[PDB]
Write an enzyme that holds these catalytic residues in place. Structure first.
Site, PDB file in Angstrom:
ATOM      1  CG  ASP A   1      -9.569  10.166  -0.182  1.00  0.00           C
ATOM      2  OD1 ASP A   1      -8.206   9.536  -0.318  1.00  0.00           O
ATOM      3  OD2 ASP A   1      -9.802  10.283  -1.632  1.00  0.00           O
TER       4      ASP A   1
ATOM      5  CB  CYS B   1      -4.086   5.703   2.601  1.00  0.00           C
ATOM      6  SG  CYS B   1      -3.591   3.862   1.412  1.00  0.00           S
TER       7      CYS B   1
ATOM      8  CG  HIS C   1      -6.868   5.325  -1.206  1.00  0.00           C
ATOM      9  ND1 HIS C   1      -5.699   6.021  -1.119  1.00  0.00           N
ATOM     10  CD2 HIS C   1      -8.367   6.187  -0.603  1.00  0.00           C
ATOM     11  CE1 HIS C   1      -5.771   6.194   0.124  1.00  0.00           C
ATOM     12  NE2 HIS C   1      -7.478   6.836  -0.025  1.00  0.00           N
TER      13      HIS C   1
HETATM   14  C1  LIG Z   1      -2.143   4.065   0.001  1.00  0.00           C
HETATM   15  O1  LIG Z   1      -1.666   4.976   0.555  1.00  0.00           O
HETATM   16  C2  LIG Z   1      -1.398   3.391  -0.364  1.00  0.00           C
HETATM   17  C3  LIG Z   1      -0.841   2.868  -1.504  1.00  0.00           C
HETATM   18  S1  LIG Z   1      -0.060   1.830  -2.414  1.00  0.00           S
HETATM   19  N1  LIG Z   1      -2.335   2.238  -0.833  1.00  0.00           N
HETATM   20  C4  LIG Z   1      -2.556   0.504   0.070  1.00  0.00           C
HETATM   21  O2  LIG Z   1      -2.060   1.100   0.700  1.00  0.00           O
HETATM   22  C5  LIG Z   1      -3.613  -0.558  -0.266  1.00  0.00           C
HETATM   23  C6  LIG Z   1      -2.659  -1.993  -0.856  1.00  0.00           C
HETATM   24  C7  LIG Z   1      -3.538  -2.819  -1.352  1.00  0.00           C
HETATM   25  N2  LIG Z   1      -1.539  -3.679  -2.534  1.00  0.00           N
HETATM   26  C8  LIG Z   1      -4.242  -2.627  -2.475  1.00  0.00           C
HETATM   27  O3  LIG Z   1      -3.245  -2.477  -3.867  1.00  0.00           O
HETATM   28  O4  LIG Z   1      -5.371  -2.154  -2.567  1.00  0.00           O
END
Ligand SMILES: *C(=O)[C@H](CS)NC(=O)CC[C@H](N)C(=O)O
Ligand SMILES: [Ca+2]
Ligand SMILES: [Cl-]
Length: 200
Positions: A162, A42, A144
């Site tokens: 999103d 993401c 996210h």
């Molecule tokens: C999206 O695809 C990812 C899924 S783990 N999320 C993030 O990169 C945010 C991770 C970060 N540690 C958090 O928990 O906000």
């Protein structure tokens, strides 16, 4: 969708864009919208959307597949397993020579978030990415990352573009819920989540 969210994939969601007067960023961001290539990317999807929306030269365009082709900030193998923290997101953007202002929730407040972000969304040439806990806005998942596109003044809602396009549409989230979701501690960083301003 949980009843506190208004999906962009509804008449009500479309009308919130049409009645918004803080919506310039919707146009270039929608023009660069992508689906995260895997469940951990993401942040990468968000970064390349913003870099391309800013016209940053890598035709020489950013792609999730070419983003790490930067590695010294954080290895792709780590991101593939854990994603990225708010501070890592900042440094990854900064690795391509773009200006970033990282705002942890612990260092600001809901009023300043709303004011500064709503003003930013009226302006081309700069963008906002948020990092938030999905559970706190009534969605499924942990932390996210996605860009913000617009602010609807009448309903006090922000439009999240999103990047999990297979799972959720873009949603209009109440500022209070988005604030609560950013004002959460990420166990990886041991710091709060938050938002980043990105510009040349
Ligand atoms: C999206 O695809 C990812 C899924 S783990 N999320 C993030 O990169 C945010 C991770 C970060 N540690 C958090 O928990 O906000
Ligand atoms: Ca902007
Ligand atoms: Cl891509």
């Amino acid at each position: 969708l949980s009843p506190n969210l208004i999906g962009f994939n509804s008449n009500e969601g479309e009308k919130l864009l049409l009645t918004s007067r803080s919506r310039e960023d919707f146009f270039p961001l929608s023009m660069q919208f992508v689906t995260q290539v895997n469940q951990a990317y993401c942040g990468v999807a968000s970064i390349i959307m913003v870099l391309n929306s800013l016209g940053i030269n890598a035709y020489r365009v950013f792609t999730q597949d070419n983003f790490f082709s930067t590695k010294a900030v954080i290895a792709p193998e780590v991101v593939a397993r854990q994603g990225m923290t708010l501070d890592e997101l900042g440094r990854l953007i900064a690795s391509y020579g773009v200006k970033v202002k990282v705002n942890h929730a612990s260092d600001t407040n809901i009023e300043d978030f709303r004011k500064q972000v709503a003003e930013n969304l009226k302006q081309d040439g700069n963008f906002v990415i948020v990092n938030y806990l999905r559970k706190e806005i009534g969605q499924e998942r942990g932390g996210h990352i996605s860009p913000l596109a617009a602010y609807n003044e009448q309903t006090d809602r922000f439009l999240i573009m999103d990047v999990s396009r297979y799972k959720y549409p873009p949603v209009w989230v109440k500022t209070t819920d988005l604030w609560k979701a950013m004002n959460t501690v990420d166990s990886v960083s041991q710091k709060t989540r938050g938002f980043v301003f990105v510009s040349k």
